[PDB]
């Protein structure tokens, strides 16, 4: 019994540097790929949950032909700051992954990133879309997936803002 996904996906892990010199190495590594629902759940069962990860960790789940990286690429990211929802990070992350691999968040969606950081964890949904009309629909659906009833947790950053030291979102929901 196999339930195929629309596309194959790869899980990547960004390991925190424990030495200064490790910042000169490639700490972003592919972990495994999957292309069925069953393969997805086997992976989830066998990797640490988000809340257990060390600071500066990232998980990236991207379509197989997409590496998790220009500033002048098209689109941007919907960034979700957990804030007061932080206790629920594992379930919110899993629901976000299901919305993505199940293709119900989407009109396209390239991948999603989990970032563990001091002071606050976040997710980022990377899209190739530019126009506010699809971006608002994506952000609204993402907000529903996360069961958020307040404003302020979601910020859309165009790819161009990546070059900045103080990037500013063009949409906040």
């Amino acid at each position: 019994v196999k339930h195929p996904l629309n596309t194959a996906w790869t899980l990547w892990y960004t390991k925190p540097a424990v030495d200064k010199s490790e910042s000169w190495s490639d700490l972003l590594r592919p972990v495994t790929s999957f292309q069925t629902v069953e393969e997805f759940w086997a992976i989830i069962q066998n990797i640490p949950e988000p809340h257990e990860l060390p600071l500066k960790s990232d998980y990236h789940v991207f379509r197989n032909d997409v590496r998790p990286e220009e500033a002048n690429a098209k689109g941007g990211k919907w960034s979700f700051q957990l804030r007061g929802k932080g206790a629920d990070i594992d379930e919110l992350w899993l629901r976000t992954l299901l919305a993505v691999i199940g293709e119900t968040i989407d009109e396209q969606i390239n991948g999603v990133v989990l970032s563990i950081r001091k002071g606050g964890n976040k997710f980022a949904l990377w899209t190739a879309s530019e126009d506010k009309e699809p971006l608002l629909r994506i952000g609204g659906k993402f907000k529903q997936v996360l069961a958020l009833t307040d404003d302020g947790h979601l910020e859309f950053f165009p790819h161009s803002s990546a070059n900045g030291r103080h990037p500013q979102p063009s949409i906040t929901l």
Binding site: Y13, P16, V18, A42, Q45, L55, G102, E103
Partner: protein
């Protein structure tokens, strides 16, 4: 032309089940635990 398969969140949960994986899950965990050990030793908690 177009092609697509969609699954709802509930559908995907209904398909959730020792489950075999294609990577070394023991080593992956060990790397992460070693990082946490070193972070704990290096952060000054007091």
């Amino acid at each position: 032309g177009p092609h697509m398969i969609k699954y709802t969140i509930d559908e995907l949960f209904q398909l959730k089940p020792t489950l075999e994986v294609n990577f070394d899950a023991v080593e992956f965990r060990a790397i992460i635990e070693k990082v946490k050990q070193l972070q704990h030793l290096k952060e000054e908690e007091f």
